[PDB]
């Protein structure tokens, strides 16, 4: 019962896959596809957020190699704020993609006055700023505490603010995006099941099945990737220790599952996109 180095192989594989996929995605949106559509703006922002998540997981790899933080306090604050900021912006970009698709299907007359690249830019800027609030809030509150070893955590005064931070992250990072995505795609598919031009025949039913399959795939990936990390965080925040050892080590693997999301959004939104395949 020991998995010391396979997690480093997982981190390296996730690093290579994420870098290759994101490099391909911004190569497409730089050399081939223009930003004249809202979906391209959303894909580019999600790819940028995924690459910024990708940049921090080598630091997670070197923390999980030997049990210390061989960097400065300013690097600790920068890395923590970047991690929180990019998690929030990736999550909100997925949520806003869901809301955009729901608007395009279930509200088609108003979508002509809503699915404008100017309004996509406005929504993206608002998402970036409303995450910049907690980004600077993590700049001001980060740091390191001597335990022996040095931990790279959030330096609360004297603690109970830790639990409030975990609850706030779990509410505005897991629950609200999951319910918004579930409601939006459920109503989208339910409206699309009663469309004459897209159902009825064999090829039309094949297209509807393909759309619904991609919907269930992306929702299942989100739930599977972000469930155990948050569940273990809340268990440790509302439990009474454990027998240590593997109960810590699999936690590292749980962190890897989060980065698994960053490996699949270029696949699930550019490789399966219809416009990028032409």
């Amino acid at each position: 019962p020991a998995i010391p180095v396979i997690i480093t192989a997982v981190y390296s594989v996730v690093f290579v896959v994420g870098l290759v996929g994101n490099s391909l995605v911004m190569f497409v949106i730089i050399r081939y596809t223009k930003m004249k559509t809202a979906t391209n703006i959303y894909i580019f922002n999600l790819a940028l957020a995924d690459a910024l998540v990708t940049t921090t997981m080598p630091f997670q790899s070197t923390v999980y190699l030997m049990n210390s933080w061989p960097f400065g306090d300013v690097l600790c604050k920068i890395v923590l704020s970047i991690d929180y900021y990019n998690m929030f912006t990736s999550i909100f970009t997925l949520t806003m993609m869901s809301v955009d698709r729901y608007i395009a299907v279930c509200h088609p007359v108003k979508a002509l006055d809503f699915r404008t690249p100017l309004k996509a830019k406005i929504i993206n800027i608002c998402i970036w700023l409303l995450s910049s609030s907690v980004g600077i809030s993590a700049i001001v509150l980060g740091g390191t505490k001597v335990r022996d070893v040095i931990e790279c955590s959030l330096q609360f005064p004297d603690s109970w603010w830790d639990l409030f931070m975990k609850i706030c992250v779990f509410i505005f990072a897991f629950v609200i995006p999951v319910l918004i995505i579930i409601v939006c795609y459920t109503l989208m598919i339910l409206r699309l099941k009663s469309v004459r031009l897209l159902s009825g025949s064999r090829e039309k039913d094949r297209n509807l099945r393909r759309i619904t399959r991609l919907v269930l795939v992306v929702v299942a990936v989100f739930v599977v990737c972000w469930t155990p990390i948050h569940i273990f965080i809340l268990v440790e925040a509302l439990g009474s220790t454990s027998h240590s050892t593997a109960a810590l080590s699999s936690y590292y693997f749980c962190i890897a599952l989060g980065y698994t999301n960053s490996c699949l959004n270029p696949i699930l939104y550019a490789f399966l996109d219809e416009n990028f395949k032409r």
């Binding site: 923390v63 933080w69 273990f232 440790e236 454990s242 240590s244 109960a247 936690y251």
Partner: peptide
């Protein structure tokens, strides 16, 4: 998990 929170 605990100790050690976490680094992270």
């Amino acid at each position: 998990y605990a100790x050690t929170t976490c680094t992270x």
